[PDB]
């Protein structure tokens, strides 16, 4: 390919217009059998409180037709060339993705470039062909025998897949919001939940969230934990470092163009324009990205103004309401922002097989119905703990269902244990919201559809969730906002309307991409991810190698990315 770089890199290959114009002149196919493919309502909607408006979309009995990419994905690699396929015209250019969106009283085509190399259908990039390419990228890294990090990953077949997953993890993961200071208060107690649940369930606590493992591997590294259980957490960070060390590397070369590093044009896991589905703090750089929320963008910085840890009545009444949004800091370093992409977007779907799905919580009615008790209202701490039944009457029912076996040591009374979670009440974050994102393509790829802007949605104040609490179920807010993290099963146990949609259309029970997105989120065609990703995630194993191959599907198809990949004889 190095000799072919004089041809493959040429601009004429990358302009949609010669292809898109003739594709529009051909028009929709006239043959009635193909007319079933034509339907697809890509309607944009405002993201103003839509996270609580989601069930109303599921109240309707109407079926959602599958997207043309979702139909093309089904075929075996040998059937893709056969006359029985009706999607042959859908992709006239591997870098792009043509389709016939059905605008009202219209049938205009909607071209949109593919970005990462894994957007291609399995008839182009079948899994077994692709993991072997991941062995080649690992081969160029001089690391063909992977390090024996698998022993902790075997726990992920248990700890994150388990129906029995503790509900306290959702409470701590919400209250921390990734802040270091919450761990600085809870560090004397949070380790007790881990040694206790590992003593019982024989599985590490807090596997679900990158924000907790990243700091427990550092701030709690001193003591608090037995060396092996902490060794699993630092081993997990070592796995995420193994992902970033296989992701691309300027070990070929570094440098930069315009401003962005060359070790970012070659992979979406590096450049800031891609965002993880979950977020705790904004990336330090936001140039080239606009965080629209309502019909008008929330992009300007005047809206943000967090002053965390201070009593703010108007701010406490501002939750549930959308604007003004705010964040404490652009805490994410490009490295921590890179591993943040590695976690929720790569490792977790690879290990859960695209099963677990996150959900929000209504912190107002939750904490008021939970805390506010007289034992919390009046807790002097100079410098009824007698009968255990009386302190159980004081902590209330929910604390007895949440704290006792899950956390406290026999030396520690339930009052002393709940005071520790009570210290975290001061970290009051905002209620769950969905932040729509629009990032125009980088100039290396912008020439394909210059007017195009990549469309995204991110679950701000969200949290990774496997099995939703059956005690906190009243305040659960399911959000199947994305292909990754979309579980019809557990979601049916929450709001009844999703269970109505499942009982009416059972076949959408699948954990892959077959479960429809809401039309508020049904912009998967503009999403950085495409059907082969999560659909392969439904069938991927758990060795470790699947986490590598998902990053290998993440390689960008930018012409500069084609150059650097060509330089290594990849």
């Amino acid at each position: 390919f190095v000799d072919a770089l004089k041809t493959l890199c040429h601009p004429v290959l990358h302009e949609p217009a010669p292809c898109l114009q003739t594709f529009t002149e051909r028009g929709p196919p006239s043959e009635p059998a193909m007319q079933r493919l034509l339907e697809c309502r890509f309607q944009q909607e405002p993201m103003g409180g839509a996270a609580r408006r989601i069930p109303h979309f599921y109240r309707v009995r109407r079926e959602v037709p599958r997207t043309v990419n979702e139909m093309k994905q089904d075929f075996v690699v040998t059937d893709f060339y056969k006359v029985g396929n009706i999607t042959l015209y859908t992709e006239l250019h591997p870098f792009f993705d043509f389709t016939h969106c059905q605008e009202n009283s219209e049938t205009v085509a909607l071209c949109t470039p593919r970005i990462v190399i894994g957007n291609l259908p399995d008839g182009l990039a079948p899994g077994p062909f692709h993991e072997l390419r991941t062995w080649e990228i690992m081969e160029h890294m001089r690391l063909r025998p992977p390090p024996d990090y698998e022993e902790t990953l075997r726990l992920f077949k248990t700890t994150v897949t388990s129906p029995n997953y503790p509900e306290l993890c959702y409470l701590v993961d919400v209250l921390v919001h990734g802040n270091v200071d919450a761990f600085l208060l809870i560090r004397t107690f949070v380790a007790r939940c881990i040694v206790n649940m590992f003593h019982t369930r024989q599985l590490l606590v807090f596997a679900h969230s990158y924000a907790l493992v990243t700091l427990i591997a550092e701030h709690l590294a001193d003591g608090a934990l037995p060396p092996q259980l902490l060794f699993h957490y630092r081993n997990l960070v070592a796995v995420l470092r193994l992902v970033t060390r296989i992701s691309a590397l300027p070990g070929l070369n570094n440098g930069q163009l315009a401003e962005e590093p060359l070790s970012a044009y070659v992979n979406a896991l590096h450049d800031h324009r891609l965002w993880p589905p979950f977020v705790t703090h904004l990336p330090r750089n936001m140039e080239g990205v606009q965080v629209v929320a309502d019909r008008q963008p929330l992009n300007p910085a005047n809206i943000e103004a967090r002053h965390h840890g201070v009593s703010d009545v108007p701010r406490l009444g501002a939750m549930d309401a959308d604007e003004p949004l705010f964040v404490d800091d652009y805490r994410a370093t490009d490295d921590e922002w890179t591993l943040q992409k590695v976690f929720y977007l790569c490792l977790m779907p690879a290990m859960t097989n695209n099963r677990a799905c996150g959900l929000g919580l209504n912190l107002k009615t939750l904490l008021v119905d939970l805390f506010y008790r007289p034992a919390f209202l009046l807790m002097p701490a100079a410098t009824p703990e007698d009968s255990i039944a009386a302190q159980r009457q004081a902590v209330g029912e929910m604390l007895t269902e949440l704290v006792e076996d899950v956390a406290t040591d026999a030396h520690t009374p339930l009052l002393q244990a709940c005071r520790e979670l009570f210290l975290a009440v001061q970290f009051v974050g905002e209620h769950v919201k969905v932040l729509e994102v629009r990032a125009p393509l980088d100039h290396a790829q912008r020439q394909g559809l210059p007017d195009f802007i990549s469309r995204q949605h991110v679950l701000y104040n969200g949290c990774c969730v496997v099995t939703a609490p059956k005690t906190l179920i009243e305040y659960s807010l399911p959000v199947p906002f994305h292909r990754f993290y979309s579980n019809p099963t557990i979601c049916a146990a929450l709001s009844d309307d999703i269970k109505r949609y499942v009982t009416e259309f059972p076949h959408y029970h699948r954990h892959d991409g077959g479960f429809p997105l809401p039309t508020a989120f049904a912009h998967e065609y503009h999403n950085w991810l495409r059907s082969p990703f999560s659909r392969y995630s439904a069938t991927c194993p758990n060795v470790l190698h699947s986490v590598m191959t998902l990053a290998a599907m993440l390689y960008k198809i930018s012409p500069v990315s084609l150059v650097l990949q060509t330089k290594a004889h990849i």
């Binding site: 043959e31 009635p32 059998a33 079933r36 006359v83 029985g84």
Partner: protein, 49 residues
């Protein structure tokens, strides 16, 4: 069921539309169905379960 089979099989006599009216001077019957490309001879195959 029978409507669904027509898509999975790809078979449909109406799908040809029998080249009604708009055919360019060529036979309207088109010798029933007729393949446009024919580098080789007539096809012949059957099967016994």
């Amino acid at each position: 069921v029978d409507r669904w089979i027509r898509h999975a099989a790809g078979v449909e006599r109406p799908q040809l539309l029998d080249t009604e009216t708009i055919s360019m001077l060529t036979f309207g019957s088109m010798s029933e169905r007729n393949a446009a490309a024919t580098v080789h001879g007539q096809k012949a195959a059957c099967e016994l379960i």
